[PDB]
Amino acid sequence: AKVVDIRIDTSAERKPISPYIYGSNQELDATVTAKRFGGNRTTGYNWENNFSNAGSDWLHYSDTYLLEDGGVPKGEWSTPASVVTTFHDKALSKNVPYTLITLQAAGYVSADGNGPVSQEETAPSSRWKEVKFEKGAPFSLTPDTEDDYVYMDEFVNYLVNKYGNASTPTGIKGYSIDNEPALWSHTHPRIHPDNVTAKELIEKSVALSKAVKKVDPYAEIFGPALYGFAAYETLQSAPDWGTEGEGYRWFIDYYLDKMKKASDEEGKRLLDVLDVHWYPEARGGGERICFGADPRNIETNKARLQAPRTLWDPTYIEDSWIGQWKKDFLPILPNLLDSIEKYYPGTKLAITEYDYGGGNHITGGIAQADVLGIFGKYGVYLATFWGDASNNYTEAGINLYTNYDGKGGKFGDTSVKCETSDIEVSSAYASIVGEDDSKLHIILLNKNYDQPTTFNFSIDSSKNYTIGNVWAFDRGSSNITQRTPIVNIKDNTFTYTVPALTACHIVLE
C-alpha cells in the first residue's frame, strides 16, 4: 500500500496564477485561455495578401496554406490580414482573453502564392517583398501590394484600427518577434540563408518593438521564440557569439541584458515577455518522449510522467543530452527566471510551444496536467501547447484546469502552498479564487503506474471544509467525469485513495 501525505496551507505562499498559461497554437477540443498565431508558416506571412511560405517543411512553397488551414472564408482571401483577423475573431468568439500574433522579422515575406521558390529565387527576388518595420509615411488600411515592401507598423495599425489597442477588451494583447530565429537559415533558407547573428537579432528586436509600440503602446512584445536549449545557450552557435557572448553565461542573459539596455536608452520597456519553445528532450525506453514516441513503450510512458520535473525540481536529472551535459542550467524554469531577475527584472516568461507527447495516452494527459500546475505555481505568464485535436488526453489535461465540469468550472487563479511527501509518485497543486479561500481547488495526480495511491490530506485554512466534489480522467476515458464526493473531512483532514494513473480536480467547500 503506497501512502502519501499532502499538506496545504491556504494562507501561505499566495501568488497569482496567470490566466494565460492554458493556451494553444492549434484549434483544440479544449477550453483554452490564449491563442498564438505562430510557428514556421508565420515567418514569411504577408499580411497584405495572406500568402506565406512553407520553408523546409514543404519544398519552400509560397501559397494559400494559412488561408485554407485557418478556415478563412474564400471571399476574404484577398482582404488584408484576413488570416489574422479570422484567427482573432475565432479566439474572441471562444471567449479567449489573450491573442498573440507573430510579426515578421527574418526579412522578407511571400510576394505571391505561385508555388515552390527556387534557390535561385532566394530573397531578394520577384518572389519576395522586403519587410520594413516602420513605414515612415502615413499608414493605409488598403496597403499597396504593388510596391516592394511590407510594413510591420502598418500591419499593427490595421489590427488596432479594427479591434482597439491592447488595453481594450477586444484588442490583440501581444506580438511575437517572428519565430525561432536561430533556425531561420535551416527552416527558411530562401528568406534568410545566413545563420542569424546575435547582433542582428537584437537590432531587429529593438527596431520592431519600437515600431509596434509607437502604434500600440499597450501591446506586449514577446521574444525571441527560441526553438530549444541550444538556441537558449548560444543562439545555435551564432557566428558572432564568441565576441558578443563574452561575459555571459548563455544567450538568454545576453538577450535580456541588451533588450534592457535598449529599453533604458529608449525610455520604455521594449521586451515584455521572454519567449521560448520547450520540447522535452527526456528519453525513456530508448526514445524521446515526444516526436514519434510509441505509446506502447511503458518505459517511455514512465519517463513522460517524470519529465515535467526538469522544469522545476533540482533533484531530478532526466535522460537526455541536456540532463547529462547542461546540469548548470537545470531546473530550467528557475534558471530562466533567475536570468530575468539578474538582467531584466519585471520581464515575464512564456513557453509558446511545447509538447510532452503521448497526447492520446493517459500519461500525456497526466504530464500535461502536471506541466500546467508547474507553470501556474512557478509564475509562467503565458503558454501555448503545440499539437492538434487528436491529442485527446492532452486536451483533458487542459480542461481539467479550464473547464472541468463542462460548464466553465475552472481551477482557482491564486496558487497556495501545497506539498506532497512523494514527488515521484504524485503531484498536487492547490489554488483559491482571488483572496478568498471559501472554495479550495486541488489538482491531484497519481503517477503510480499499476497500483492505487492513498493520500492523507491535512489542510490549514480559515474555513472548515465539509465536502470535496471530484472530477477526473483516467485510462477508461479522456472525458472528464464527476466522481463520488469526498465527505468525511475531520478538522480539515481526510484520506482519499486514487487509482493508478488518474488525474483529479477536487473542489472543497
Ligand X SMILES: OC[C@H]1O[C@@H](O[C@H]2[C@H](O)[C@@H](O)[C@H](O[C@H]3[C@H](O)[C@@H](O)[C@H](O[C@H]4[C@H](O)[C@H](O)[C@H](O)O[C@@H]4CO)O[C@@H]3CO)O[C@@H]2CO)[C@H](O)[C@@H](O)[C@@H]1O
- List residues binding Cl ion (CB under 5 A): 180, 182, 226-227, 231
**Residues annotated as part of the active site:** 180
Contact of residue 227 among Zn ion, Cl ion, Ca ion, none (CB under 5-8 Å per partner type): Cl ion
Q: In the stretch 194-233, what mask flags binding to ligand X with x, by CB under 6 A?
A: ---------------------------------x------
Q: State the sign of the Cα–Cα–Cα–Cα dihedral 179, 228, 32, 70.
A: positive
Identity of the residue, 157 or 179, whose beta carbon is nearer to ligand X in the bound complex: 179
Stretch that binds ligand X, among 60-68, 303-311, 375-383, 460-468 (CB under 6 A): 60-68
Identity of the residue, 135 or 361, whose beta carbon is nearer to Ca ion in the bound complex: 135
Calpha distance 381→387 (Å, rounded): 20
- Indicate whether 39 belongs to the interface with ligand X (CB under 6 A): yes
Residues 391-410 that bind Zn ion (CB under 5 A): 392, 395
Q: What is the DSSP string of 181-208?
A: GGGHHHH-TTT--SPPPHHHHHHHHHHH
Ligand-binding annotation for 422, yes or no, is no
HSE toward the beta carbon, residue 151, CA cutoff 13 A: 22
Q: Is 315 helix (H, G, I), strand (E, B) or coil?
A: coil
- Indicate whether 27 belongs to the interface with Zn ion (CB under 5 A): no
Calpha distance 245→234 (Å, rounded): 8
- Binding region for Ca ion (CB under 5 A): 144, 147
Q: Give the position of cell 558578443.
A: 244
Stretch that binds ligand X, among 37-45, 124-132, 331-339, 392-400 (CB under 6 A): 37-45
Identity of the residue, 106 or 501, whose beta carbon is nearer to ligand X in the bound complex: 106
- Indicate whether 179 belongs to the interface with ligand X (CB under 6 A): yes
Identity of the residue, 58 or 325, whose beta carbon is nearer to ligand X in the bound complex: 58
Stretch that binds ligand X, among 59-67, 239-247, 308-316, 448-456 (CB under 6 A): 59-67
Q: In the stretch 340-379, what mask flags binding to Zn ion with x, by CB under 5 A?
A: ----------------------------------------
Chain-centroid distance of CA 440 in Å reads 26
Calpha distance 9→504 (Å, rounded): 19
Stretch that binds ligand X, among 51-59, 130-138, 368-376, 394-402 (CB under 6 A): 51-59
Nearest Cα neighbor of 275 from 243, 252, 244 is 252
Q: What is the DSSP string of 241-265?
A: HHHHTTT-SSHHHHHHHHHHHHHHH
Nearest Cα neighbor of 404 from 394, 412, 396 is 396
Which of 48, 153, 178, 180: binder of ligand X (CB under 6 A)? 180
Task: Tell me the backbone φ, ψ of residue 216, rounded to 5 degrees.
Answer: -130, 95
Identity of the residue, 297 or 360, whose beta carbon is nearer to Zn ion in the bound complex: 360
Calpha distance 127→144 (Å, rounded): 16
Please list, in sequence order, all residues whose beta carbon lies within 8 angstroms of the beta carbon of residue 234, skipping any fewer than 6 positions away: 241, 245, 250, 251
- Indicate whether 61 belongs to the interface with ligand X (CB under 6 A): yes
Which residues of this protein are in contact with Zn ion, per CB under 5 A?
Answer: 29, 389, 392, 395
Query: Which residues are annotated as part of the binding site?
Result: 29, 48, 144, 147, 149, 389, 395
Annotated binding site for Ca(2+), which residues? Answer: 48, 144, 147, 149
